[PDB]
Design a binder for these strands. Structure first.
Lengths: 50, 114
RNA sequence: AAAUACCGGCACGAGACCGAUAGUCAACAAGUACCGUAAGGGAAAGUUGAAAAGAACUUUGAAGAGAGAGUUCAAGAGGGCG
RNA sequence: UUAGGACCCGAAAGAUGGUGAACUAUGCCUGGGCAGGGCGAAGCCAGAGGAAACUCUGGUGGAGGUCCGUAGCGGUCCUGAC
RNA sequence: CCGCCGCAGGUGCAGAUCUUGGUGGUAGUAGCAAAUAUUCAAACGAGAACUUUGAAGGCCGAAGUGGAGAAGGGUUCCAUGUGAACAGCAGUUGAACAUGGGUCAGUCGGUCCUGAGAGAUGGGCGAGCGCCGUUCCGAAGGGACGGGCGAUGGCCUCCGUUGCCCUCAGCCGAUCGAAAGGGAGUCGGGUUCAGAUCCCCGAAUCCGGAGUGGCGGAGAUGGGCGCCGCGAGGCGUCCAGUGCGGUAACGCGACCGAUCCCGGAGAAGCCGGCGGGAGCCCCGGGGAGAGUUCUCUUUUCUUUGUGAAGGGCAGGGCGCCCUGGAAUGGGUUCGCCCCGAGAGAGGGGCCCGUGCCUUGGAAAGCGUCGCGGUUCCGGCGGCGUCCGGUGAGCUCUCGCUGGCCCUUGAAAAUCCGGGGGAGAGGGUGUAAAUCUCGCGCCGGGCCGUACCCAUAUCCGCAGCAGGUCUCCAAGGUGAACAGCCUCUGGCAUGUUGGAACAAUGUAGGUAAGGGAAGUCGGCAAGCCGGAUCCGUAACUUCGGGAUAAGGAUUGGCUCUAAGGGCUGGCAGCCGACUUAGAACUGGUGCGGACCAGGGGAAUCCGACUGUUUAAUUAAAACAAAGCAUCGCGAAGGCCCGCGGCGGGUGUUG
RNA sequence: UGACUCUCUUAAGGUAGCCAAAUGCCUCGUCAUCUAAUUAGUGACGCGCAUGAAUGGAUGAACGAGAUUCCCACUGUCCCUACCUACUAUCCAGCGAAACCACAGCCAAGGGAACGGGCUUGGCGGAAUCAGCGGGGAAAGAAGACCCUGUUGAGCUUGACUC
RNA sequence: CCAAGCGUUGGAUUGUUCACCCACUAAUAGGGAACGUGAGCUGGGUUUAGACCGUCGUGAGACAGGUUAGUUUUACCCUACU
RNA sequence: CUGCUUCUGGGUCGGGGUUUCGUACGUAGCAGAGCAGCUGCUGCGAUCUAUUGAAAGUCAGCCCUCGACACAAGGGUUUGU
RNA sequence: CGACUCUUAGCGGUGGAUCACUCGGCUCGUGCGUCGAUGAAGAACGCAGCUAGCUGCGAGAAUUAAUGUGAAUUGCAGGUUGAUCAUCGACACUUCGAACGCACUUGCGGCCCCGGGUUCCUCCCGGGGCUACGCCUGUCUGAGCGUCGCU
């Protein structure tokens, strides 16, 4: 909710910084396996735990 | 007509969360948060149901601010006990003490004759 | 003490074994994504080519998607493509 | 032919150790919430009738696991819809 | 990669409702049908039933599709793009996608307290992980007020600062436990693309603090002699002073003081009635801008203010007090209820003041009418921001007073007053010790703060007709928070549109004559329905039955009578709402929509109210009061536990 | 018919009440009553298969989304159906599943695992279809919940066995 | 005897098939079609789970004994028919 | 099932016929229960009366139009003994 | 006639079988046999010029130093007295965690020291060193109508 604990707000803060796509230059590398970010999570799709 | 919201996050009509309608110099109705009705102090005799006179009926932690003269009436047991049951506990404090001296004097009789 | 045990741990060698629905659940960002309040449950998913040389430039369409060209032995190998 | 998973697939169970009362059951603590009306109990005042206990009468009063009924709570019947 | 000769095996598939992966027919089929509803023009654009803007017509109709929060969500918030995929048609559109940006506090919460409870230590048990128990089998206090030698900062001056050890001390419990309980204190305007009691401007306010304590005020300048000289007076001394006033309730801007003690506040339930206060609605005027004007309308609509904190003042209330003595009893309420234990009557005093006014304060805000600044702005001017009546009105709040209970409705932190009188204070002053008085000074860290809050941000696999805790609450009709209609506010008819109007559906209706002949069964539907006014049975636990049953009136318009304040059996002046009566009148229509009981005579069961199989049984079942036995006087009954000097009933009898 | 009588008889033989009742086998009991007609309801009748006293008997005002019955009024429940409205279905733009499926799909008889879509013998047979439709596919659904079997279990009980 | 062309009803009581009765009538014949016909209905009866009674059983429970309350699903396939 | 140039044709509109409902708006009235204001005038006023068998609808699947106004001399796809 | 439908072949879609690979398994054998109050395992949260995951890492944060190695790192920018890799013995190693001052809210204390506020002289702010229980040996201050002792 609006009423958060400091520990939970740092938990959410990590999950937002992990919910960005791959940089466009990453798959121009030599050992190129990654196409897109498979671990991208959406607020309707998956509910983050908690 | 001004249908108006709480300014705090307490969304319930609780003992702490009681309000009053207050028109503002911006010309709109809004809630001000009423401090509770702090009551007068009661007599230490604990018989008279009517609370004390000359002492402010106020929240208990406010009385740090109030001057000494706001908090007590100028008398023996002033601001702690009702003046009616002060003047019953002045007479009794004397008339019982008088009765002790009659016992002190009647004890000075019953042994001098044997 | 020594002979003795060792389906964990560190570092190694080898196989009449298995060859991506097999072999560990996991050959890959695997105890991952995901599910359950929790204990726990738990995947799918390898391959362009010798080298990106990964299709310049022209032209239809709003663009997707085409037709020409061009690279290559081969695109009858065109970005999940032997 | 056995004994072992014993050709492969299959029970209803039995056991051991753990996880749950966010639903729900019940106690407890602490908060919030329930239009508008109808009947009109005790107590109370005046009056009327007779000899007292008394007996009648008109107001007042606002009780009740009271009644009609909204919000809320519930879920009868259509064995309607689906 | 293979033939031959040997070797070895996880060695041959059509089946196992086999396992995994893929694809068919069905099939461009079922479907995109809950809650009234969309149309026109323009814009951007490649593109419009859907987007955006204006104009229509509508819905929600203040218990809302409105404006906010708790729980949950976690970036969904806001802007700028593109419009591949997703949003069950579309899309220039989104809560999708990608780039960014965004949550500011002494005062609002969290922190703190304790609640039911959780839970260490001692102890007990335990093979043991551990477990029991929370004051019970414990040496459970590391604090102060006091006295010398030493000592450090300061002219060791004499205190702050230290140590030894001597005087001095209950709670009986570590610790956790509430974003709805306790809990000092921030409100008004302005501002952003998204943030405000947080930011800016301006007004306050709470707590804490300071080493020789920074200003004023209080404590504190009284008494009585002895000389000088025209007297004030000057000056030498023996004394006082830890404040004053009111008959009182109590007052005054301070008004010393510890361990100890005592009390209060914190801190009390639901319900009824009544009164005050606002806000809101209503009413008659006066401004301002709009609407209408085809006729009528001095018209209709919007707007018309003033924070916290001080003072003053109405206004409530008193179970506060002073003379004073009441039967011919009086006062007084809607109801009460009060009185020689001191009623009426008079004079006071106090608490509450959320209302009025004033400081804040017009400088802002709002309504307007204008002028610039091409944009650089909280731009600058002119006016107005009014005067009354109101009330069983509605809601919240502050009181007064009752009624109900085999029901008695929280603790603790915290704060304050009191009673005591150990002490301290100075020697007539340059007064002291001391102060809850008025200013002054410094400080307030830490975490949460965006947004949705639900027919699209939560939980049901989803934009799921489900579920999910609250706050505010306009006008009309009306008994009404009923239903319907409208204003502010919000919306695009709920995952699609267009054209047809067959069957059969789903949901509404209407039916001649009959009337339950239908059928297991009057099931579904219907009838009845409001109010006034009559009238009301059997039976009864005398409470009821009862809206029994069964009748009459209801419209509109127009009068009449009755029902009140106020100012000094009267006149004058301001009325706010009903009841009753009679007239007149319409095509007998009139509770005209809406709201909204079918009725009687018996039988069985269960007294009733309550409850019950969440998702097929709401019942005659369960519960129930009542009634009746039974056990037990505590080393006890009844029960729990692996265990114990264990635990529940038990804060018991 | 049975007060009364004789015996057996067990702990003592059902008392007060109540009834073809939510309790009566026979049963649609018998009589009355409600009807034109009543296996219903009701009031009576009691040798009552198998009523009966806190395993409570008999009643009972009030009450009930409880179970029955008759009556009045009211009605499309019916005689006996018709019409209208909204949303569908229908047609089209866009979108787009699923169950199910040995192969499949016209009948009569015959035989057959005794009830054929196919086999035999006759009927006969004509593309692709659309809205309907419920005869059939012993249609789908779910390894019958009944029943029996298993030396398969579970919840419960006691005078089972072992603790 | 030829003979099934065409008729064979309205109702009270019971879930009833079966009867029985009222009344009309030309007559109020008997049957079959998976004891016709539940993706046609209805759910009264049976025959789940809830309850009550009687008898039975120490008991849990039992009864072609009586009693009340109890979810009746799908067609869009192929034929058949329209 | 029909219609789409006889200077003719249907349609659209209007006019009649029809029938349905039952007397419009406005005006006028010493008609109107009355009441209120000024000294008889005059306001509010349900309703009644005349105007008025009035007004309004009427084919969209009614009848006749010979009155207006346009429009109709077309397009597409196929088809041979 | 065709259309529809069937059969077959070619080509083309759909789908991912087969086959060929293989920085992965599994199995067997061998040597070694090492965690932690000097803060383990684990967990959280951070850190790159552009970096979400994966690894690497710890405010010195895809690493510092050192020794070796001797010219790259590389997806793209940029700037030999040793680039870069391996090694790693020096240093460093935020928060929870047996987790350690008392609590899980990252909330509240204490004592000693320092530095701002100052020129010790307190509040205030920041920083630092300590503050957990059980126990062991010694130490210290105590306690007892324990046992006695001397006056």
């Amino acid at each position: 909710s609006s009423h958060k604990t400091f520990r939970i707000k740092r938990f959410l803060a990590k999950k937002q910084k992990q919910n960005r796509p791959i940089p466009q230059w990453i798959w121009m590398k030599t050992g190129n396996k990654i196409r897109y970010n498979s671990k991208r999570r959406h607020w309707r799709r998956t509910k983050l735990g908690l | 007509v001004q249908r108006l919201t709480y300014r705090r996050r307490l969304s319930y009509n609780t003992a702490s969360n009681k309000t009053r309608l207050s028109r503002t110099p911006g010309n709109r109705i809004v809630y001000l948060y009423t401090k509770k009705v702090g009551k007068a102090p009661k007599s230490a005799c604990g018989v008279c149901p009517g609370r004390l006179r000359g002492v402010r009926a106020v929240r208990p932690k406010v009385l740090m601010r109030l001057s000494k003269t706001k908090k007590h009436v100028s008398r023996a047991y002033g601001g702690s006990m009702c003046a009616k049951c002060v003047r019953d506990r002045i007479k009794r404090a004397f008339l019982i003490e008088e009765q002790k001296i009659v016992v002190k004097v009647l004890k000075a009789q019953a042994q001098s004759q044997k």
